[PDB]
């Protein structure tokens, strides 16, 4: 159920690795920067129940299953 995931960015302090049910590659235009993030998703009994995010202007999220699946995937804005 749990994979190893690449960890880059805010949620990863200050580790390169991560453990979750899904790995993600994230992107958002923040403060004139195209900030990128990689890490984990894990289902709890409430809150965010989906790794996948409904698309919004300025943001894009792409999720995957498998060990280090997020390594060769990067979220690209449409």
């Amino acid at each position, epitope marked *: 159920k749990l994979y190893m995931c690449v960890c*880059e960015g805010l949620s990863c302090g200050n580790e390169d690795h991560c453990e979750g049910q899904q790995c993600f590659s994230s992107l958002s235009i*923040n403060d*004139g920067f195209h*900030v*990128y993030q990689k890490g984990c998703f894990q289902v709890y009994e409430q809150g965010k129940m989906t790794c996948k995010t409904p698309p919004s202007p300025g943001q894009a999220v792409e999720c995957c299953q498998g060990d280090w699946c997020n390594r*060769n995937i*990067t979220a690209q804005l449409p």
Partner: antibody
Amino acid sequence: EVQLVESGGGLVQPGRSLKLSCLASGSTFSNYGMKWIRQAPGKGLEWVASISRSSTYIYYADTVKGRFTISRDNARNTLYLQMTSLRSEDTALYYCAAAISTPFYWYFDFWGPGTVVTVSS
Amino acid sequence: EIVLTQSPTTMAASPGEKVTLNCLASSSVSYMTWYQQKSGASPKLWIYGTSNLASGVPNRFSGSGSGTSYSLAISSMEAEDVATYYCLHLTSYPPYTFGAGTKLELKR
């Protein structure tokens, strides 16, 4: 749309400190993120440091991390690079550049003439 | 960390000749940025996104690619095209890495 000019460069000694400055045309300065890219003589381009529009996000290169500090002043339209514990391989021409952000892409643009930093005894 | 390999290191082309400069990445990347640098001059933005020319850049220039393999192209080699061309990676968490560069010369 924006002009950038670098300064503060010169001869410096190993293990010592120096502060580079990048003065903008403005006042569009506070509309873009800012970057430092260095070029060693006879060699390629190496990204050094990044700072977002309001100093929210800061990034460094690994060879530079801990030693250098990137600063910003939107009121004075100036970008800074505090350099400490300077090494022989830090000897380079130092460009400052603005990050241009579109909803599809981002890139570096409007690179200045650069400033020469030399680290030797 | 992404590593960009540019090919060839140097090439010399006759006026009018078609040119392709390659930029290979160690992993898959979203898009590729290209810069032209002339001697004693700063690098200018040449191609952003993957295939988008900067303003002032001739239509003679072209960009293409996907995943790891990316290329800059010239439909007709000219004298003003003499420079070193660098590809830059931008589409991840730092560092933002440049390739070694391809020095382009004009056969005369």
